[PDB]
Amino acid sequence: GPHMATGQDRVVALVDMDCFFVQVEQRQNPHLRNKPCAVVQYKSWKGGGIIAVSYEARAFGVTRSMWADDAKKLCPDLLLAQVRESRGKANLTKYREASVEVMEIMSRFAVIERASIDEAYVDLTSAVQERLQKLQGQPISADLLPSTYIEGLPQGPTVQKEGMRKQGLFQWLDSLQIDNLTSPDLQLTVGAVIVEEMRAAIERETGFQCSAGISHNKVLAKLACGLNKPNRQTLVSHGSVPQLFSQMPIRKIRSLGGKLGASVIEILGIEYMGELTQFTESQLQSHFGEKNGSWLYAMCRGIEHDPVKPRQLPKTIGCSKNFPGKTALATREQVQWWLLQLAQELEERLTKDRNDNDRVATQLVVSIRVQGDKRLSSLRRCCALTRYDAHKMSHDAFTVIKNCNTSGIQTEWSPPLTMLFLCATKFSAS
DNA sequence: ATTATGACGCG
DNA sequence: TGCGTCAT
Numbered sequence: 001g002p003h004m005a006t007g008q009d010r011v012v013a014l015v016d017m018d019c020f021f022v023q024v025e026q027r028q029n030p031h032l033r034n035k036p037c038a039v040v041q042y043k044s045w046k047g048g049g050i051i052a053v054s055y056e057a058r059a060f061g062v063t064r065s066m067w068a069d070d071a072k073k074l075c076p077d078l079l080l081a082q083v084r085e086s087r088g089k090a091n092l093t094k095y096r097e098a099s100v101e102v103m104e105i106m107s108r109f110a111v112i113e114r115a116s117i118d119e120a121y122v123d124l125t126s127a128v129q130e131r132l133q134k135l136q137g138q139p140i141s142a143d144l145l146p147s148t149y150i151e152g153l154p155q156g157p158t159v160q161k162e163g164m165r166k167q168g169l170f171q172w173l174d175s176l177q178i179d180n181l182t183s184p185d186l187q188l189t190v191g192a193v194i195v196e197e198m199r200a201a202i203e204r205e206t207g208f209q210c211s212a213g214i215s216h217n218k219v220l221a222k223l224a225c226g227l228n229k230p231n232r233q234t235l236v237s238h239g240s241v242p243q244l245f246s247q248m249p250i251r252k253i254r255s256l257g258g259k260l261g262a263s264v265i266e267i268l269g270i271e272y273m274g275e276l277t278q279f280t281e282s283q284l285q286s287h288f289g290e291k292n293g294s295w296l297y298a299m300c301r302g303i304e305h306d307p308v309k310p311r312q313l314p315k316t317i318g319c320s321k322n323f324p325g326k327t328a329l330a331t332r333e334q335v336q337w338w339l340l341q342l343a344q345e346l347e348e349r350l351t352k353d354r355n356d357n358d359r360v361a362t363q364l365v366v367s368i369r370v371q372g373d374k375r376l377s378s379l380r381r382c383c384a385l386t387r388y389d390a391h392k393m394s395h396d397a398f399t400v401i402k403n404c405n406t407s408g409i410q411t412e413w414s415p416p417l418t419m420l421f422l423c424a425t426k427f428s429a430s
Numbered sequence: 431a432t433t434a435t436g437a438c439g440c441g
Numbered sequence: 442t443g444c445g446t447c448a449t
């Protein structure tokens with residue numbers, strides 16, 4: 001009743017760039033605009049591995065992870081842009097820099113949490129309060145929400161997508177009580193207006209389009225964002241949760257897309273998020289642990305408290321390269337040359353990071369994979385990162401892993417290494 | 431022979 | 442502290 005929390009205390013948005021690496025390449029090369037196109041890395045093996053795909057190309061069934069040779073079978077006119085290669089490896093600098101462009105624009109509107117190279121969470125609670133004050137009871141026009149969907153509407157007593165969007169929006173706004181500055185639904189609506197403004201600024205200032213979700217927490221905002229892509233935003237109200245969750249596969253919710261979600265399904269014998277409501281908090285804790293159990297209990301009711309962390313910069317700077325099948329490094333010399341290549345890229349990125357962001361990494365993490373291991377990583381060791389010097393970093397990394405060589409003959413390496421990874425971590429202010 | 435990233439919880 | 446998990 002009066003004491004049952006409803007998790008409607010915050011307004012949180014999640015902004016997610018549409019087919020990001022593709023847009024970066026399309027801005028640069030207008031020939032790629034409004035075409036089926038994809039971004040690929042490493043042309044030689046099966047045409048290269050696809051890592052991003054335009055919506056035009058998705059219509060043909062082109063997907064990430066597909067080899068370009070195979071994508072061409074589905075879409076013979078598929079256009080391709082290649083990831084830059086430097087020092088014998090893919091180099092993602094262009095995309096990291098494009099990401100900074102967007103993150104800096106978003107930061108003008110509110111504090112952001114960088115979730116990935118092209119996603120950020122925004123806590124709009126304070127901004128919404130301010131905008132509500134300026135509005136002073138004034139109604140919110142549908143014109144302020146030109147690309148917004150209201151999940152769950154229209155409902156109750158046009159056959160085209162845009163017609164439906166407007167019908168749903170109209171029902172939502174018609175029902176809104178703009179009188180109360182503490183109405184959660186009103187707060188979400190004002191949040192959506194601000195996100196329209198944010199997304200317009202991103203597009204004006206970078207050329208990039210994105211989608212967004214607006215709701216009361218990060219999980220719902222993320223879920224909302226994916227409901228209407230691309231180039232649209234979706235408001236998921238607290239009230240929309242029971243219907244939305246009633247047919248929502250568990251794996252769709254963030255953090256449940258893997259083994260835990262599979263266990264929830266198997267152990268409880270359910271399929272949809274809404275079905276979770278029938279278990280007590282203790283029951284859920286009994287199967288999935290205290291933390292997960294409490295999280296699931298609240299989440300299936302649309303409630304979650306993870307804060308939007310004030311963090312715009314990545315916490316680590318790393319680089320890695322696989323050496324698959326035949327290319328597996330089998331000589332100390334090889335291991336040393338490749339560690340150096342990685343270290344030179346790392347040095348370059350670290351030096352730029354130190355100049356831009358007034359911080360220095362203090363720990364170097366070295367990771368490798370050995371042939372045959374099904375695990376992404378087979379090992380991880382750390383050493384002090386005391387100088388931004390590629391030769392020193394690569395020498396220290398070697399020193400740290402050299403004891404893995406089961407070889408008897410000094411020169412050779414066994415078993416061959418199929419992955420090298422260097423990561424700078426533990427930043428301090430400088 | 432997907433590959434190249436990045437954050438976080440358990441212990 | 443190293444590993445596993447989950448995600449872009």
Ligand SMILES: Nc1ncnc2c1ncn2[C@H]1C[C@H](O)[C@@H](COP(=O)(O)OP(=O)(O)OP(=O)(O)O)O1
Nearest residue numbers: 016017018019020021022051052053117118434449
């Ligand atoms: N598994 C991956 N390997 C390498 N790069 C990836 C991988 N997943 C994503 N990326 C890169 C390329 C993407 O353009 C960028 C953002 O990823 P993501 O948001 O998942 O898809 P996307 O932005 O290409 O399409 P969408 O419009 O569906 O968001 O990160």
Ligand SMILES: [Ca+2]
Nearest residue numbers: 016017018118
């Ligand atoms: Ca994206």
